[PDB]
Amino acid sequence: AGNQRQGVAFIRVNGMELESMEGASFTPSGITREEVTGSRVYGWKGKPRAAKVECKIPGGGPIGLDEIIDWENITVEFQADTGETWMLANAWQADEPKNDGGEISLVLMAKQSKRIA
Amino acid sequence: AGNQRQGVAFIRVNGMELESMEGASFTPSGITREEVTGSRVYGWKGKPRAAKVECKIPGGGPIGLDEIIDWENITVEFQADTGETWMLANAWQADEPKNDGGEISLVLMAKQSKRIA
Amino acid sequence: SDISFNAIPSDVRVPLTYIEFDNSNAVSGTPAPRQRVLMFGQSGSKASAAPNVPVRIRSGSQASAAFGQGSMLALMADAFLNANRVAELWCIPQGNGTGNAAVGEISLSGTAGENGSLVTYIAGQRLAVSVAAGATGAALADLLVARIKGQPDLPVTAEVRADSGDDDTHADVVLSAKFTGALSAVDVRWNYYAGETTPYGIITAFKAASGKNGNPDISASIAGMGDLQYKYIVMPYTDEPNLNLLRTELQERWGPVNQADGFAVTVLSGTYGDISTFGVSRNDHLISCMGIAGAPEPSYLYAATLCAVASQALSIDPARPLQTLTLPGRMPPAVGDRFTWSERNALLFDGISTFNVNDGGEMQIERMITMYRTNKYGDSDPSYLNVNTIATLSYLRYSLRTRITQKFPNYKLASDGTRFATGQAVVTPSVIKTELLALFEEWENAGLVEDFDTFKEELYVARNKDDKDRLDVLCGPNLINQFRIFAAQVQFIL
Amino acid sequence: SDISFNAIPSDVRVPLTYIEFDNSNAVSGTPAPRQRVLMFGQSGSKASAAPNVPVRIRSGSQASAAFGQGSMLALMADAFLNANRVAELWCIPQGNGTGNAAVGEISLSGTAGENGSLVTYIAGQRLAVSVAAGATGAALADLLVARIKGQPDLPVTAEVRADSGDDDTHADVVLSAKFTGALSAVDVRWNYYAGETTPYGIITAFKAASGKNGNPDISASIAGMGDLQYKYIVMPYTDEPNLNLLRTELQERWGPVNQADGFAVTVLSGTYGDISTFGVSRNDHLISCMGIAGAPEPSYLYAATLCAVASQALSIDPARPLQTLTLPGRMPPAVGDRFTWSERNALLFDGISTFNVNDGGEMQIERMITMYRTNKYGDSDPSYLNVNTIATLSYLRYSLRTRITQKFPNYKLASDGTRFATGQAVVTPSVIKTELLALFEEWENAGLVEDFDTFKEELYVARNKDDKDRLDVLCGPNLINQFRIFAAQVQFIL
């Protein structure tokens, strides 16, 4: 809004909004720039990057864990409470999913994310 | 001032002052001196260094994240509240930008910084 | 529409490959906004281009068709395109001027007593006719007339004439130019290269015309140029009435109002004294003239080639000196007609540029300077002397304009020390100070300015107390030096 | 209106960027109320500035245009601006004085027997003319006259003259200054740097004028200065009638009534005895003079440079000694014309400041002291000696005035011990006591005063028993010392 800052974020997979915990991460897909020095400082150098979305889901919810561990081609939407939205298409569930005391960690990853709306 | 010490720092990119969090870093560009010992202590040895500016920006602000991840040739100005100013020209956004709970980390980097004003 | 296609319909639907052959070597019409040049020249009869109207020329054949074969402008355009194929070329024709079309006559007499060849150089073009034993002057004149009629690029027409009670061998050829003007006169030589000689018993002579012609007026042409930025201008007419208008227009464009920088390159052909007098007379900082004596080719060809080379070199880099660049296809004068070291030094001190002759037959630029010699009060002034200075100043102005109009499209002005805080799109004189410092860093890294601390200490940015919407800045750059003179002293021990 | 714009209209509405190039290097007109200085100087003919009227000068070209090229004031302003670009500069022209414009003649005779060069230094300006084998003195004189006419910054005019029954080689050049005064005479040298010599067979000599000139009156100029506070004043006229008026005005300003502190910096050129006599004669604590013998450059240039350097240094800090600061662009005298250690020590004991020559060719300040030498009863007095003392006293007075006028704009006075209670805006002598103690703490932290307990014990604040609206305070500060002499003794063991 006029002075509103981002306090919470919403993550939606295939239209189902996920019961996400506090502290949800988001890494846009782009170019990672490194540093080059020889006898002096010369410039930077690029490296491709992949979009990542991280969150935590309580256990026993509407969405089962077997469904979570079987996501290969899904649509992930990351929306901030202020109104900023990013869309991830053909995403997949990466890393090892674990149910640690009712906490399930999602590492939903995609090869390209664009800022819609 | 007469007894004023640095309490806060302001970072401005292309004239837009950034909404920076507490604890903003700044590494001047110069020569890093190492240590040389053989059978005795002989002296030091140099190595080039690159200017770095680090800060954090809240999510949902006036400046979008897509703009942040697309900075290749920008002007970065680091000014202390007391009056010390450093200018970074032809800077770029380095490392991986992440939106972790409304926090965006900037690693704005340049190959040379001079103290203006 | 960049490539002009012939006999290929624009509405073709058969999927295949269409290949055409054309002898003329056209130039790609890629826009070059930073390399727009303009050329002034005369057009002869049978021309299809309206006078005082600029037209884009991209091939020699197109120029010849538009301005007529053998015209001044067509030859100048061909010379420019034979050396620079990257810059935009615009040519605007002129009128006809005042004077007479006659330029002189070539007198041939005597009889040849041995086999040989007769080589005549008219306007820098070699014309060779075989000479047989016992041949008379009249037959050689007829062969020369036929050869001249064969050549379509000569800006002269030749007719045979024989009269008087002299021997039948004598017969002189009358030459008439294709246009009227001060540059209609041409040069005639019979031996330029080594191993060439007149056959024995043949007497050759050339008598120039007595009348004097005048260059056509350029007021309509200078008024109809347009509003584009022509960075370089080619003016062959070296006369006071035209140069005054050109200087007025250029100095009106050079001012902070128009900001459309322009430069003019001219070449003057004549004796050393005349060149020195002209250079002393003119005191403009926007025109550079190169003096040459006894040039086999007309002056405007040299002017076109020099302007093309200089434009390309300065567009590549505005600070690199023009010290050893060569002019392709331009014949240097004779050995006895070249200026000595003292003459070249005096010409450089008199505001006249000088050239040099390579170890072979190539002609190379030596040093390019402007006509500016005297301060406003009458003292000597080394500023505005080298063409590199003007080029660098123009580039700096363009870069500053681009940076200001790009980084700050439309902002709001506030005084220094006011508390505006984050978010607002206001500009403080300190902001402009920092942006100018960054631009200066870019300039220094590009290799244009040398000293940074002095520039920073001499900077001053402030608001205007009357306009309230105008920001006044006073800056001084230290233009970098050029490597010109290498003085050495050798102390041998033997 | 801080930046003077040329050819740029003040009423422009097209939104764009306007860029102009100007050769003159102007100085920003930022106000500097604490660094206002005034300069006295003569103006030659063709001047456009009204006499006895102060004008703000911000560039060398503006000064030259206003006071005429080659004038004393223009050269002084250029010298000041070449070393100090932060202080406000005000220049007030003078009249013409009495005397004659002739300053001497340069006599050249003989013939050159070898190739070489002739270098003549007139008023500290190098003038080199090429010398050819067999050249006569008359030709060299003509070349020298042409070179002098070429140089517009020389405050002399040169004419050639040849007569008498001597050889045709002999021909002397007559020099005439651009203004009349005691400083119109100049110095002429033929060899200043190493590796320079007169060509063999050439005899050169200089004969100075016999008449004596007088400095113009400054009564109108000193009356028309205004009411501003000129902290530093440049006076080149070293004569008793002018210095008496300057001393009267300065001591009237130095008093507690006017409170507009001012200082004057002068340079006297002459023999050691004359400098010593002048220093002994003058006994003022508001004027500092530096003595120099055999100076290639005129005295006022040294005065301007020294005043600029001293003003900047004292404005940065009033307590830092002036021990190693260098004077940029000022040529030191010859090796045999520099004062020895004993001469410098005697000059310092005689109230004359001394300079020093750096390891290279740079001239540096050695120690700056005032003319004050003698107590009122005739005894010796070390007070009011160093310029740092006067600067510190002026700064302390200004700071105390500012603090009193700021913390207590308009109050009401009550006696000590009265019961006024909270709320009322009355002031007690104890309040002023505490405020003075706090200001003294600030002064000590700033690095100006050393001892606090003694200052507190010597303080005394009381009301006046007659005015009833005036508070009388008597305080004594302990001005901090400066590190001048480092005495060492080495006891080697070998």
Coordinates of N, CA and C in Angstrom, one line a residue, chain B:
Chain B
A1 N 30.2 15.6 13.5 CA 30.2 16.9 14.1 C 31.4 17.1 15.1
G2 N 31.2 17.8 16.2 CA 32.3 18.0 17.1 C 32.6 16.7 17.8
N3 N 31.6 15.9 18.3 CA 31.8 14.7 19.0 C 30.9 13.6 18.4
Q4 N 30.2 13.9 17.3 CA 29.2 12.9 16.7 C 30.0 11.7 16.1
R5 N 29.5 10.6 16.4 CA 30.0 9.3 15.8 C 29.0 8.7 14.9
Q6 N 29.4 7.8 14.1 CA 28.5 7.2 13.1 C 27.5 6.2 13.8
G7 N 26.2 6.5 13.6 CA 25.2 5.6 14.2 C 24.4 4.9 13.1
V8 N 24.2 5.5 12.0 CA 23.4 5.0 10.9 C 24.2 5.3 9.6
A9 N 23.9 4.5 8.5 CA 24.4 4.8 7.2 C 23.3 4.7 6.2
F10 N 23.5 5.5 5.1 CA 22.5 5.6 4.0 C 23.2 5.1 2.7
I11 N 22.4 4.3 2.0 CA 22.9 3.8 0.7 C 21.9 4.3 -0.4
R12 N 22.5 4.8 -1.5 CA 21.7 5.4 -2.5 C 22.1 4.8 -3.9
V13 N 21.2 4.3 -4.6 CA 21.5 3.7 -5.9 C 20.8 4.5 -7.0
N14 N 21.6 5.1 -7.9 CA 21.1 5.9 -9.0 C 20.2 7.0 -8.5
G15 N 20.5 7.5 -7.3 CA 19.7 8.6 -6.7 C 18.6 8.2 -5.7
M16 N 18.2 6.9 -5.8 CA 17.2 6.4 -4.9 C 17.8 5.8 -3.7
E17 N 17.5 6.5 -2.5 CA 18.0 6.0 -1.3 C 17.3 4.7 -0.9
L18 N 18.1 3.7 -0.5 CA 17.6 2.4 -0.2 C 17.1 2.2 1.2
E19 N 16.0 1.5 1.4 CA 15.4 1.2 2.7 C 16.3 0.1 3.3
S20 N 17.4 0.6 4.0 CA 18.4 -0.4 4.5 C 18.1 -0.7 6.0
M21 N 18.5 -1.9 6.4 CA 18.3 -2.3 7.7 C 19.5 -1.9 8.6
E22 N 19.5 -2.2 9.8 CA 20.7 -1.9 10.7 C 21.8 -2.8 10.3
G23 N 23.1 -2.3 10.6 CA 24.3 -3.1 10.3 C 24.6 -3.2 8.8
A24 N 24.9 -2.1 8.2 CA 25.3 -2.1 6.8 C 26.8 -2.0 6.7
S25 N 27.4 -2.9 5.9 CA 28.8 -3.1 5.8 C 29.4 -2.3 4.6
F26 N 30.7 -2.1 4.7 CA 31.4 -1.3 3.6 C 32.9 -1.7 3.6
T27 N 33.4 -2.3 2.5 CA 34.8 -2.6 2.4 C 35.4 -1.8 1.3
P28 N 36.3 -0.9 1.6 CA 36.9 -0.1 0.6 C 37.8 -0.9 -0.4
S29 N 38.0 -0.4 -1.6 CA 38.8 -1.1 -2.6 C 40.3 -0.6 -2.4
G30 N 41.2 -1.5 -2.3 CA 42.6 -1.2 -2.1 C 43.5 -2.4 -2.2
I31 N 44.5 -2.5 -1.3 CA 45.5 -3.6 -1.3 C 45.4 -4.3 0.0
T32 N 45.2 -5.6 0.0 CA 45.2 -6.5 1.1 C 46.6 -7.0 1.4
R33 N 47.2 -6.7 2.5 CA 48.5 -7.1 2.9 C 48.6 -8.4 3.7
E34 N 49.4 -9.4 3.2 CA 49.5 -10.7 3.8 C 50.8 -10.7 4.7
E35 N 51.1 -11.8 5.2 CA 52.3 -12.0 6.1 C 53.2 -13.0 5.5
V36 N 54.5 -12.8 5.6 CA 55.5 -13.6 5.0 C 56.5 -14.0 6.1
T37 N 56.7 -15.3 6.3 CA 57.7 -15.8 7.2 C 58.4 -17.0 6.5
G38 N 59.7 -17.1 6.6 CA 60.4 -18.3 6.3 C 61.2 -18.8 7.5
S39 N 62.5 -18.6 7.5 CA 63.3 -18.8 8.7 C 63.1 -17.6 9.7
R40 N 62.7 -16.5 9.2 CA 62.4 -15.3 10.0 C 61.2 -14.6 9.5
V41 N 60.9 -13.5 10.0 CA 59.8 -12.6 9.5 C 60.4 -11.6 8.5
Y42 N 59.9 -11.5 7.3 CA 60.6 -10.7 6.2 C 59.8 -9.5 5.9
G43 N 58.4 -9.6 5.8 CA 57.6 -8.4 5.4 C 56.2 -8.9 5.0
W44 N 55.6 -8.0 4.2 CA 54.3 -8.3 3.7 C 54.2 -8.4 2.2
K45 N 53.0 -8.7 1.7 CA 52.8 -8.9 0.3 C 51.4 -8.5 -0.1
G46 N 51.2 -7.8 -1.2 CA 50.0 -7.2 -1.6 C 49.1 -8.1 -2.4
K47 N 47.8 -7.7 -2.4 CA 46.8 -8.4 -3.2 C 45.6 -7.4 -3.4
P48 N 45.1 -7.3 -4.7 CA 44.1 -6.4 -5.0 C 42.8 -6.7 -4.3
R49 N 41.9 -5.7 -4.0 CA 40.7 -5.9 -3.4 C 39.6 -5.1 -4.1
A50 N 38.3 -5.5 -4.0 CA 37.2 -4.8 -4.6 C 36.3 -4.3 -3.6
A51 N 35.7 -3.1 -3.9 CA 34.7 -2.5 -3.0 C 33.4 -3.3 -2.9
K52 N 32.9 -3.3 -1.7 CA 31.7 -4.1 -1.4 C 30.8 -3.2 -0.5
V53 N 29.5 -3.3 -0.8 CA 28.5 -2.7 0.1 C 27.4 -3.7 0.4
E54 N 27.1 -3.9 1.6 CA 26.1 -4.9 2.0 C 25.0 -4.3 2.9
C55 N 23.8 -4.7 2.7 CA 22.6 -4.2 3.4 C 21.4 -5.2 3.2
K56 N 20.3 -4.8 3.8 CA 19.1 -5.6 3.7 C 17.9 -4.7 3.4
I57 N 17.0 -5.1 2.6 CA 15.9 -4.3 2.1 C 14.6 -5.0 2.4
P58 N 13.6 -4.4 3.1 CA 12.3 -5.1 3.3 C 11.6 -5.4 2.0
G59 N 10.8 -6.5 1.9 CA 10.1 -6.8 0.7 C 8.9 -5.9 0.6
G60 N 8.4 -5.9 -0.7 CA 7.2 -5.1 -1.0 C 7.4 -3.6 -1.0
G61 N 8.6 -3.1 -1.1 CA 8.9 -1.7 -1.2 C 8.7 -1.1 -2.6
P62 N 9.0 0.2 -2.7 CA 8.9 0.8 -4.0 C 9.7 0.2 -5.1
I63 N 10.9 -0.3 -4.7 CA 11.8 -0.9 -5.7 C 11.6 -2.4 -5.7
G64 N 11.2 -2.9 -6.9 CA 10.9 -4.3 -7.0 C 12.2 -5.2 -7.0
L65 N 11.9 -6.5 -6.8 CA 13.1 -7.5 -6.8 C 13.6 -7.7 -8.2
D66 N 12.8 -7.7 -9.2 CA 13.2 -7.9 -10.6 C 14.2 -6.8 -11.0
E67 N 13.9 -5.5 -10.5 CA 14.9 -4.4 -10.7 C 16.2 -4.7 -10.0
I68 N 16.1 -5.3 -8.8 CA 17.3 -5.5 -8.0 C 18.2 -6.6 -8.7
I69 N 17.6 -7.6 -9.2 CA 18.4 -8.7 -9.8 C 18.8 -8.4 -11.2
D70 N 18.6 -7.2 -11.7 CA 19.0 -6.8 -13.0 C 19.9 -5.6 -13.0
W71 N 20.7 -5.4 -12.0 CA 21.6 -4.2 -11.9 C 23.0 -4.7 -12.3
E72 N 23.4 -4.2 -13.5 CA 24.7 -4.5 -14.1 C 25.6 -3.3 -14.1
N73 N 25.1 -2.1 -14.4 CA 25.9 -0.9 -14.5 C 25.2 0.2 -13.7
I74 N 25.4 0.4 -12.4 CA 24.7 1.3 -11.6 C 25.7 2.1 -10.8
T75 N 25.3 3.2 -10.2 CA 26.1 4.0 -9.3 C 25.6 3.9 -7.9
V76 N 26.5 3.5 -7.0 CA 26.2 3.3 -5.6 C 26.9 4.3 -4.7
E77 N 26.2 4.9 -3.8 CA 26.7 5.9 -2.9 C 26.5 5.5 -1.5
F78 N 27.6 5.4 -0.8 CA 27.6 5.0 0.7 C 27.9 6.3 1.5
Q79 N 27.0 6.7 2.3 CA 27.1 7.9 3.1 C 26.8 7.6 4.5
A80 N 27.8 8.0 5.4 CA 27.5 7.9 6.9 C 26.7 9.1 7.3
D81 N 26.1 9.0 8.5 CA 25.3 10.1 9.0 C 26.1 11.2 9.5
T82 N 27.4 11.0 9.8 CA 28.2 12.1 10.2 C 28.6 13.0 9.0
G83 N 28.8 12.4 7.8 CA 29.1 13.2 6.6 C 30.2 12.6 5.7
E84 N 30.7 11.4 6.1 CA 31.7 10.7 5.3 C 30.9 10.1 4.1
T85 N 31.4 10.3 2.9 CA 30.8 9.8 1.7 C 31.7 9.0 0.8
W86 N 31.3 7.9 0.3 CA 32.1 7.1 -0.7 C 31.2 6.8 -1.9
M87 N 31.8 6.9 -3.1 CA 31.1 6.7 -4.3 C 31.6 5.5 -5.0
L88 N 30.7 4.6 -5.5 CA 31.0 3.4 -6.3 C 30.4 3.6 -7.6
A89 N 31.2 3.5 -8.7 CA 30.7 3.7 -10.0 C 30.8 2.4 -10.8
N90 N 29.9 2.2 -11.8 CA 29.8 1.0 -12.6 C 29.8 -0.2 -11.7
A91 N 29.0 -0.2 -10.6 CA 28.8 -1.3 -9.7 C 27.9 -2.3 -10.3
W92 N 27.7 -3.4 -9.6 CA 26.8 -4.5 -10.0 C 26.4 -5.3 -8.8
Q93 N 25.3 -6.0 -8.9 CA 24.7 -6.8 -7.8 C 25.3 -8.2 -7.9
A94 N 26.0 -8.6 -6.9 CA 26.7 -9.9 -6.8 C 26.0 -10.8 -5.9
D95 N 26.5 -12.1 -5.9 CA 25.9 -13.2 -5.1 C 24.5 -13.5 -5.4
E96 N 23.8 -14.3 -4.5 CA 22.5 -14.8 -4.8 C 21.5 -13.9 -4.0
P97 N 20.6 -13.2 -4.6 CA 19.6 -12.5 -3.9 C 18.4 -13.4 -3.4
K98 N 18.1 -13.3 -2.1 CA 17.0 -14.1 -1.6 C 16.1 -13.3 -0.8
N99 N 14.8 -13.6 -0.9 CA 13.7 -13.0 -0.1 C 13.3 -13.9 1.0
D100 N 14.0 -13.8 2.2 CA 13.8 -14.6 3.3 C 13.0 -13.9 4.4
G101 N 11.7 -14.2 4.4 CA 10.8 -13.6 5.3 C 10.6 -12.1 5.2
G102 N 10.6 -11.6 4.0 CA 10.6 -10.2 3.8 C 11.9 -9.5 3.8
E103 N 13.0 -10.2 3.9 CA 14.3 -9.6 3.9 C 15.1 -9.9 2.6
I104 N 15.5 -8.9 1.9 CA 16.3 -9.1 0.7 C 17.7 -8.5 1.0
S105 N 18.7 -9.4 0.7 CA 20.1 -9.0 1.0 C 20.8 -8.6 -0.3
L106 N 21.5 -7.4 -0.2 CA 22.1 -6.8 -1.4 C 23.7 -6.9 -1.1
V107 N 24.4 -7.3 -2.2 CA 25.8 -7.5 -2.1 C 26.5 -6.6 -3.1
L108 N 25.9 -5.4 -3.4 CA 26.3 -4.5 -4.4 C 27.9 -4.3 -4.3
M109 N 28.5 -4.5 -5.4 CA 29.9 -4.7 -5.5 C 30.5 -3.8 -6.7
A110 N 31.7 -3.3 -6.5 CA 32.3 -2.4 -7.5 C 33.8 -2.7 -7.5
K111 N 34.5 -2.3 -8.6 CA 35.9 -2.5 -8.7 C 36.8 -1.4 -8.2
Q112 N 36.2 -0.3 -7.8 CA 36.9 0.9 -7.3 C 36.0 1.8 -6.6
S113 N 36.3 2.3 -5.4 CA 35.6 3.3 -4.7 C 36.5 4.4 -4.2
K114 N 36.1 5.6 -4.4 CA 36.8 6.8 -3.9 C 36.0 7.6 -3.0
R115 N 36.6 8.2 -2.0 CA 35.9 9.0 -1.0 C 35.7 10.4 -1.5
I116 N 34.5 10.7 -1.9 CA 34.1 12.1 -2.3 C 33.5 12.8 -1.1
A117 N 33.6 14.1 -1.2 CA 33.1 15.0 -0.1 C 33.7 14.6 1.2

